[PDB]
Amino acid sequence: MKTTIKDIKTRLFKIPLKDHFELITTTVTLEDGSQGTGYTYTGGKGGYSIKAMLEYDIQPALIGKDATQIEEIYDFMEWHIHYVGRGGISTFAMSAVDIALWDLKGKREGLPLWKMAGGKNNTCKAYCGGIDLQFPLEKLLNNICGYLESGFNAVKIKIGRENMQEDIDRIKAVRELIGPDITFMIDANYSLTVEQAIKLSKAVEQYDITWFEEPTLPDDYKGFAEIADNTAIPLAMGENLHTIHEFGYAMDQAKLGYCQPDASNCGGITGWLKAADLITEHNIPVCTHGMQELHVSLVSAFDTGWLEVHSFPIDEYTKRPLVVENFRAVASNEPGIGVEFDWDKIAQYEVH
């Protein structure tokens, strides 16, 4: 059958940073020879685990099937590895496959992802964050000036030192530099307690902080609600939510103002849409985490939230690095997911 899945190949790359992040490619070949690649990525752990799952648990089960029936295959995968699923490694792996199918669906239908995911805009608000917690203060600000002159009107910094006061300092430093008009967000990486967080959001309400990202453990939905009810800075989370249920819980109880689903680990573009469709119902901004190359097509598709521009140069090893027109990420009109890996450049980082 024309669209029947004939082969699937999955490669793992260790790519250096500035220490290193993982990239997992997954290429689906069809009957008529059409190809499509999807991917997922990591901050350094579980690359092998993801590739093992794909290569033993999921891929051989997928050979034979019709690549056009993507919801079907998605659903099938979720039940197939359920015992060792319900999030974790299993969802990275699922994403990689689902994205490649979306890619074939794009090339097949001659449509770019931004129109495929709903097509409400081809451009979107963006903002830069860094792996900046350990950074000396002057080093941080010189970095942020960099972002502002590259063409971005919003920045973000990590907070969460045992020395709380050092954090309120760095937040005030950045607001001085950027002035009234540039947007400011903070991300705590679930290092705070509820009461620790409430301390900090109270201490910096004055700096027009646009959101407080993952203030406490993301598994603490009541926690967030306790925070938000003692706080006037909008709460944000999503990175680490891997299941449409986990997003369900977040809307139901977490009282969030901004939600950031990551297509690479909440089950690809099918899952991401599940999440974004949900978030929209709750009249909340649809934002994203990591994977700028892909997500620009997705944020722009719902036109409502921020595209996070992450440190990982995943886009530096593709054909089209993120494109900015005045303070806005621009999405590719090329059919597919609008991402296409520079195979020759990453080939040196492939592993095993």
Q: Which residues are annotated as a binding site for Mg(2+)?
A: 187, 213, 239
Cβ pair 288, 126 in contact under 8 A: no
Q: Which residues are identified as catalytic?
A: 158, 289
Closer to a copy of itself by CB, 8 or 286: give it: 8
- Whole-angstrom Cα distance, residue 288 to residue 29? 29
Distance in Å, CB of 61 to Mg ion, minimum: 23
Position 78 contacts Mg ion (CB under 5 A): no
Phi, psi of 118 (to 5 degrees): 130, -20
Binding site for a copy of itself (CB under 8 A): 42-43, 45-53, 55-57, 79-92, 217-220, 240, 242-243, 245, 249, 265, 352
Cβ closer to a copy of itself: 148 or 244? 244
Closer CB to a copy of itself, 173 or 244, in the complex: 244
**Interface positions, 223-242, toward Mg ion (CB under 5 A):** 239
Smallest gap from residue 324 Cβ to a copy of itself (A): 27
Please state the closest distance from residue 240 (CB atom) to Mg ion, in A.
8
Site string for Mg ion, 182-201 (x = CB under 5 A): -----x--------------
Angstrom distance (rounded) from CA 184 to CA 158: 11
- Out of 214, 220, 246, 308, the residue judged to bind Mg ion by CB under 5 A: 214
d(CA 153, CA 326): 9
Q: Which residues contact 307 (CB under 8 A, 6 or more apart)?
A: 124, 125, 126, 127, 287, 288, 292, 295, 296, 299, 300, 329
Helices (H), the chain: 47-52, 59-62, 70-80, 89-109, 113-116, 137-150, 164-178, 194-204, 221-228, 244-253, 268-281, 292-302, 343-346
Q: How far is the CB of 189 from Mg ion (least distance, A)?
A: 5
Site residues, Mg ion (CB under 5 A): 187, 213-214, 239
